[PDB]
Design a protein around this nucleic acid. Structure first.
Length: 172
DNA sequence: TGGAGTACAAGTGTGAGGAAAAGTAGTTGGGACGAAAGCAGTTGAA
C-alpha cells in the first residue's frame, strides 16, 4: 500500500515508459502540423515543461495575466483517429521488437486503461520483499500511534541497504 | 454391426523472456624597499 524507499528498476519498466515517450514525441509534433493547417526521446520530452522543484505540481496564481479566452473549435472522433494514425503507423515496427506485454501495455494504455499492476509488487527480489514489508509495517504503527514498535521497524529499515531519504527524515 | 467425423491428451520444434553489477551517458562544480650630484662632450641658435 504505502510508498517504498527503493531505487527499483526493471527492463520491462524501462522499456514501457520509453515505448510510451517515444510515441508521445511523434503525436505531439503531429498535433502541431494540424495546428499548422489550422534523441533520448524522454529527455527531449521534458524540455516542454518546467519541473516545479518547490511543490509537486506547478501551481500558479490565477487572477492575473496568465488567463486565456476559451478556444472555440473542439475535437471529434473523425479528426482524432486521423491525427493519431500516422504516429500509430511508425510505432508498430518497434512494437514487434519490444516484449509482447510491453506491447500489450502500449496497446492497452492508448485506449484508456491505465495499468492495474503496481510496479513494486512483482519485483520479487527478496530484499525488496522485506523493504515493502517493513514500510507497510512502518506506517501502520505510526497510523496506530504505536511508537516503541514503529521505532523498532524504523531502526531496522535504515540498516537494510538501498533505502532512501523518503523513509529517513519524514517520520522523525 | 462396419464407417464418417473429431475433441482430449500424449508428445515435438521454435526464441523470448529474466536478472544483476559492472561499465558509460550529460550536466555541474572546480584547477592556476628606488621621484640621487655637479659636470662634460655635443649642440642649441646668435
Amino acid at each position: 500500500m504505502f510508498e517504498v524507499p527503493i531505487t527499483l528498476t526493471n527492463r520491462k519498466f524501462a522499456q514501457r515508459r520509453k515505448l510510451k515517450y517515444q510515441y508521445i514525441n511523434y503525436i505531439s509534433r503531429r498535433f502541431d502540423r494540424i495546428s499548422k493547417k489550422s534523441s533520448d526521446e524522454e529527455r527531449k520530452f521534458w524540455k516542454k515543461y518546467e519541473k516545479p522543484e518547490k511543490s509537486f505540481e506547478i501551481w500558479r496564481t490565477v487572477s492575473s495575466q496568465n488567463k486565456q479566452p476559451i478556444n472555440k473549435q473542439k475535437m471529434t472522433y473523425h479528426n482524432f483517429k486521423k491525427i493519431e494514425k500516422i504516429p500509430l503507423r511508425k510505432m508498430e515496427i518497434p512494437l514487434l521488437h519490444c516484449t509482447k506485454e510491453n506491447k500489450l501495455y502500449f496497446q492497452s494504455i492508448s485506449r484508456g486503461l491505465e495499468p492495474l499492476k503496481t510496479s513494486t509488487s512483482e519485483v520479487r527480489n527478496y530484499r525488496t520483499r522485506h523493504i515493502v514489508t517493513l514500510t507497510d509495517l512502518l506506517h501502520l504503527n505510526v497510523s496506530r500511534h504505536n511508537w516503541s514498535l514503529a521505532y523498532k521497524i524504523f531502526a531496522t529499515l535504515i540498516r537494510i541497504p538501498g533505502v532512501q531519504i523518503k523513509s529517513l527524515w519524514g517520520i522523525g
